[PDB]
Amino acid sequence: ADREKLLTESGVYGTFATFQMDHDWWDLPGESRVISVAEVKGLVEQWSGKILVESYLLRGLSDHADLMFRVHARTLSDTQQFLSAFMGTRLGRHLTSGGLLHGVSKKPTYVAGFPESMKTELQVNGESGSRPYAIVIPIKKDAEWWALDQEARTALMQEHTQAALPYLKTVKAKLYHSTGLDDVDFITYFETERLEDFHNLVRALQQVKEFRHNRRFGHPTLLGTMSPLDEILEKFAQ
Amino acid sequence: ADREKLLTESGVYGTFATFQMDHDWWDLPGESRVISVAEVKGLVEQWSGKILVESYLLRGLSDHADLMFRVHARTLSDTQQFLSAFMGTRLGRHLTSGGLLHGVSKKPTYVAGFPESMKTELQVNGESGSRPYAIVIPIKKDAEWWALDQEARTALMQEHTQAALPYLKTVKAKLYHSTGLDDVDFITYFETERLEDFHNLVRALQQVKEFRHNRRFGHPTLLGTMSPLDEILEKFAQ
Amino acid sequence: ADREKLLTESGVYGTFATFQMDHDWWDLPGESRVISVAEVKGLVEQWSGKILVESYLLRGLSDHADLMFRVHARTLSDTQQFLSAFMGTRLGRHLTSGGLLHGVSKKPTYVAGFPESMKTELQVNGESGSRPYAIVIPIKKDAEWWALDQEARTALMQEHTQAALPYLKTVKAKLYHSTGLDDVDFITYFETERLEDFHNLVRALQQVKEFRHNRRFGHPTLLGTMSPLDEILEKFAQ
Amino acid sequence: ADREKLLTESGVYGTFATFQMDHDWWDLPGESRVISVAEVKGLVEQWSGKILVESYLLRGLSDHADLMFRVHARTLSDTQQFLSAFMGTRLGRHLTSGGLLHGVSKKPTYVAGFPESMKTELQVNGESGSRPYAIVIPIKKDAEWWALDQEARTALMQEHTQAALPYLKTVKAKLYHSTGLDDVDFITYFETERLEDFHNLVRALQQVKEFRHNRRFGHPTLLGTMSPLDEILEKFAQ
Amino acid sequence: ADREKLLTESGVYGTFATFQMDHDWWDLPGESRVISVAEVKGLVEQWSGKILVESYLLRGLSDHADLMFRVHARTLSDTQQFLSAFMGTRLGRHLTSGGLLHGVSKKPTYVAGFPESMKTELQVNGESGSRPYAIVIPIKKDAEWWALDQEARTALMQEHTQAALPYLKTVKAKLYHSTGLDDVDFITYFETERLEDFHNLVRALQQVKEFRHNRRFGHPTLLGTMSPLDEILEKFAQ
Ligand code: HEM
Ligand code: HEM
Ligand code: HEM
Ligand code: HEM
Ligand code: HEM
């Protein structure tokens, strides 16, 4: 059950790591490539004790990116060790590291102050399907947002949540608190089988006032398809 | 007829994919290059069932770009599969992927609220010629735009449309709704045999108020000439 | 006389194309380099029917640039074909394409509304010398500029023109209308034997109000020396 | 004891130097790599008279960076000579230099003007552990900050200090005065065993008014693990 | 004495050229590298008639840069010819050219309008030492600055000069007028034996009003050590 503990509980660090495959990877024979896929596969299993790693095919959906990992760990030391080991494998040595972002999952700041009916809706179980699309949008808030007192922010966030409620059924959302660990305040992560819903979700949110306090939004916006690592890697060994 | 259903109907995803050819492609003999063009040509025909692909020569018109595809598909899964297959062909292995943008085609938001005579003019058949120039300008709206109510935006869009009406006859326009799928809100796409008209069209639009709510406009602005894939690729195999 | 028709008449497209030579070019023997200069020389002659090409030594004057062409053509199709052919020559295959900008030459928008004495001074023949320095500054206007009515813009332009009049004799100026063909509204081009004069010219213009409506100015500012192609290329074949 | 004099005394220059390992490093045999690690190790020891160098593993924590040095020296001349020597070693020749920033340590400008109890708290010994995480955030103040008089700035800094006091015990902080030696005003450096606390510390500080006078903040924000040089380099010679 | 005429007189153009050494330079044997240093050394002496060149070790002090020349010439033609010949030497062919900026030295615009005591202090001889640190900060003024009349700017500059007077003794300053020749208005250049003083100088200047009319400041800020060309190049041939 500890797999779920990393995915839901607070205190857990989440890292998003992007990679792009070099040209000269394909100058390697398909034999050696398949051997290299085995190494990576094996390294991940070795770390299955200390961290949970999920993989996404970004190739053909996000610019300048083929692969993303989402890594859950209780210390970033562990995530560092893993990612460094990964980048050291034969396969990793032909990758170019793109972006890298960290944030901790936390007990919610505002939700207690929302009405009880809104709390009930937030508990009712949302999207949960196999091989969803996944989106990742990093966000930095403006100075104005921190200047507001708690009551003001709580009210703006209630408005946010209200706009989003109709999309709970078809879009799963997870929030990571990132300030100080890199150049952004939050990493937002989403899963959905229907991208048009996620698009409508973001359009709904562009109406709420809070959404203009986002000094940075995307850059990049990462789009991909969530899949087992073997499947993604096996595609590269052809 | 399903080819036109992808080009006109709502719900269809449109992807714009840019590529640049490596120096070392030309270090390959003209024989192997012509072989490689056959592979790509064949791959596209294999996907002719599930997607429609159109090609544009950007070399010599847009900076740092040789080729662009506009890809229509009902799911971005299919577009992903295609693009990844493409990038894997021998030809694709010597390409560097530039930008990548997605947006869904939608039933119009404001046009119902326009006067009847304007609706008639929008129906009257515009530009439709062979081997036109094509332009692509990605756009992100400012926060102020979303703060406006529906009535205010409808009025601003009627003004936009009015400015553009005289150009219907010589410029074809298509709009893709992109928010959430990448870093922009819209992808605008245009065809014309006379670039002067398109330039005059944009100047006319720079007068309307709405046009200042474009927090981002171009970067890149892509200019090319639309042509059959064999013609473009054949040029690279010389 | 048609050479002058391309340089002065309206409707003519002007393209500015920058290039930088790769390190590995020099790894080629001086024999092959001279052969390659012949090929380029020959290609230009073959296009002398449909376009006019002029060349500028940017090496040592503009950062990250060795060569610039200014190409006049009546369609960008023809400019595309040429530049693509050029980039295909053995010499072109060792070049890295820098920036690329287009604009059409047009009948003047404001000059009719100026006083008659100012019209006469604008007619009086300015600088025209061999092997001048050449400068190219791209410009994008701010939203405020388009919000102004014609009367306001004509008055601001009369002020611009007034500031510039004393420099007509030692600086030649040409303006290209670029909006919609790339990320800028204008391409400005100048020739002078005395760079201090051009520097004073720009200083004089930084006083006029209109000059603060330039949301983008330069980036890059291109400086070079105008010369026959054979002389530039010959220098690289040593 | 002079090691501590460099780390705490005023007048001492501090340099932060980032590096990333090239792909072709791994194309060298493990033999030669181990040789190369010996050379660097030896160079550092030769400079142990004139400078103190500390090392941080950025690989897997900061994007596009594997290694950082923090170098203390009494002249930047010495730091120059060392870094240039380092970049010349065989290992250094397969590195790509990322960012580089300098600042001098100074006697505090505002702390004398704080209340006595706050001064006592600042003296009380904070975090001091082995192999901490390290963070580095470069900062540039806005024009408004310098326009304030000394009294206004003292008051805003007292507020900053207050917000940060609870974190003294679990976060060590060091400030370098950087204006004029590069494009920023300050380099901030931190050590902590608990990244959660650092994150909370930055959140607490986002409430104070002074924190909005930071025209630039991060870009990059550097995150790593502090460790002996032999251990980091050893990792690369596998 | 004409060496000093280029360094002090008006009308003289000054060019700042930055370079970085390729990895593959060190793949050349130490024999060939020392031969290459001879070539460059000789080329400089051949141009000793027409231009004065001074060299600076940027490696280890400025990011992404190893070498800088400051070149004084009466025409930029001569600077262009030199730099191009330089970049063509075997040594220059393994260099990557970084930034490049030009500006003319001019008779002062405001100093006549200052009080007489301030004029006397400006005459009293400042810093002049061997092998100083050198700093170069490019500056672009904001639109507001040019909107001001001459009296306003003279007053703002007197305030600048007053803030700076105490540093005349330990910092030498030189100003180049750059508008129109590249993307900035001024190139500022400084020599000092004590970097702490220069830092304090810039801090003192950050309090004057004029200093917030700098729309761009640095990017880059170049820091190095001034030395004979032999010594710098010799270091690279080891
Ligand atoms: C799927 C529907 C969504 C729901 C139900 C939802 C709900 C919430 C809730 C309840 C919070 C408050 C967390 C707390 O109390 O600590 C929150 C925060 C946040 N949400 Fe969403 N959200 C949704 C979609 C989105 C989207 C699409 C984005 C942006 C792409 C987004 C961006 C954020 C950000 C940046 C915060 C943190 C703001 C802050 O605490 O200062 N959310 N969301
Ligand atoms: C060729 C003639 C043109 C016509 C007839 C036209 C017409 C329209 C119409 C009717 C809409 C509203 C669609 C809806 O109801 O959702 C629209 C939207 C839009 N148009 Fe155009 N347009 C033209 C050219 C352009 C050009 C040149 C651009 C920009 C390069 C442009 C940019 C946009 C954008 C960004 C929107 C989305 C507005 C929004 O919903 O915020 N149009 N256009
Ligand atoms: C020889 C000195 C110059 C003269 C005589 C001159 C004259 C003019 C005139 C008459 C126009 C308006 C043309 C029309 O009515 O369509 C114009 C437009 C323009 N000029 Fe100049 N100019 C000079 C130098 C410059 C310089 C140095 C720059 C900037 C580097 C510049 C930037 C522009 C721009 C961007 C426009 C287009 C403005 C608009 O139409 O919205 N000019 N110039
Ligand atoms: C417990 C941790 C911290 C403490 C105890 C602390 C305390 C202080 C104190 C006392 C000063 C004044 C130095 C003087 O008077 O000359 C100062 C300056 C400064 N601190 Fe902190 N701070 C802490 C954390 C941070 C953090 C997390 C940041 C930013 C990420 C930061 C940014 C700065 C900056 C930029 C200055 C210079 C302000 C100026 O002189 O304009 N500090 N800090
Ligand atoms: C020894 C210290 C300095 C002294 C004595 C000094 C003095 C002066 C003087 C007298 C002028 C006006 C000359 C004229 O009439 O054109 C001037 C201009 C200027 N100085 Fe300084 N300066 C010093 C340091 C600096 C520094 C550190 C910077 C920036 C890093 C700087 C930036 C400028 C700029 C951009 C101008 C041109 C202002 C304009 O004409 O718009 N100066 N300086």
Side-chain angles (χ1 to χ4, degrees), chain B:
Chain B
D2 21 317
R3 196 177 151 185
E4 194 78 63
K5 291 177 200 287
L6 297 166
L7 268 164
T8 59
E9 291 184 352
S10 69
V12 176
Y13 291 85
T15 294
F16 289 83
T18 253
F19 305 95
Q20 207 185 349
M21 187 66 102
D22 295 348
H23 292 264
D24 64 281
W25 162 262
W26 309 98
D27 308 337
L28 297 152
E31 315 215 329
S32 59
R33 280 185 281 149
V34 176
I35 279 169
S36 297
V37 310
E39 194 201 10
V40 159
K41 194 70 161 47
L43 172 70
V44 168
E45 201 186 326
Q46 195 178 334
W47 280 88
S48 68
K50 225 168 282 144
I51 71 185
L52 181 52
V53 169
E54 297 168 51
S55 311
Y56 308 87
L57 180 62
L58 277 52
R59 182 171 191 94
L61 286 192
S62 299
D63 140 297
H64 303 102
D66 295 326
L67 173 81
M68 186 186 86
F69 286 150
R70 172 168 75 139
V71 179
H72 299 114
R74 300 283 193 194
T75 84
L76 283 189
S77 273
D78 294 355
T79 299
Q80 191 177 37
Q81 307 288 52
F82 169 72
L83 284 180
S84 160
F86 173 76
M87 282 180 303
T89 64
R90 187 186 324 285
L91 178 305
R93 312 208 195 100
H94 304 294
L95 294 176
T96 304
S97 51
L100 188 67
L101 292 177
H102 324 268
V104 50
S105 69
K106 255 182 145 69
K107 276 176 144 194
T109 286
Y110 307 101
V111 177
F114 297 167
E116 196 57 35
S117 87
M118 186 178 265
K119 291 188 210 183
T120 281
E121 295 178 57
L122 281 179
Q123 292 169 49
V124 299
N125 282 319
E127 144 63 10
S128 48
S130 47
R131 286 188 175 75
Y133 295 99
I135 309 85
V136 172
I137 307 197
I139 290 150
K140 181 159 182 207
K141 288 298 193 189
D142 63 17
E144 289 62 18
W145 177 259
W146 311 114
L148 301 168
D149 58 70
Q150 190 74 336
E151 180 177 352
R153 277 179 278 102
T154 305
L156 286 177
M157 288 322 302
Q158 192 193 349
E159 196 179 312
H160 177 96
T161 308
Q162 191 82 46
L165 277 184
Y167 297 89
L168 280 159
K169 215 168 185 169
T170 57
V171 168
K172 182 166 183 150
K174 187 152 166 113
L175 177 60
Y176 297 83
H177 297 269
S178 176
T179 309
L181 302 190
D182 48 50
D183 281 350
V184 301
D185 294 310
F186 305 104
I187 310 157
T188 63
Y189 168 84
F190 305 93
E191 299 173 10
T192 169
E193 308 266 78
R194 272 190 219 68
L195 282 168
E196 180 110 67
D197 295 354
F198 178 72
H199 160 78
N200 294 340
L201 171 66
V202 174
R203 170 63 186 102
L205 276 166
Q206 283 173 312
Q207 308 184 254
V208 317
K209 302 176 96 86
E210 166 263 0
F211 213 90
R212 89 179 79 178
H213 287 282
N214 296 335
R215 162 141 170 163
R216 196 191 121 174
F217 192 92
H219 304 271
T221 307
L222 293 176
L223 178 62
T225 45
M226 179 174 133
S227 306
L229 183 49
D230 36 18
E231 316 254 298
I232 293 168
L233 296 175
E234 167 259 2
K235 285 189 173 182
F236 286 109
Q238 282 167 246

Side-chain angles (χ1 to χ4, degrees), chain C residues 79-151:
Chain C
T79 293
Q80 170 163 67
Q81 303 267 115
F82 168 76
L83 281 170
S84 169
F86 171 75
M87 288 175 289
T89 69
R90 189 175 271 294
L91 191 140
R93 276 175 284 156
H94 292 279
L95 285 174
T96 319
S97 67
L100 194 61
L101 301 165
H102 317 287
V104 61
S105 70
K106 284 182 82 194
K107 291 154 183 295
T109 282
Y110 304 99
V111 184
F114 297 159
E116 214 79 340
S117 69
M118 187 174 276
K119 287 188 218 179
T120 293
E121 300 156 40
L122 285 169
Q123 284 286 108
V124 163
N125 261 315
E127 187 273 332
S128 251
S130 65
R131 302 167 212 290
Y133 295 102
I135 320 83
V136 180
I137 299 166
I139 296 164
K140 181 156 171 177
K141 288 302 198 177
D142 65 10
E144 293 70 44
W145 176 258
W146 310 114
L148 294 167
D149 64 298
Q150 186 92 329
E151 195 188 319

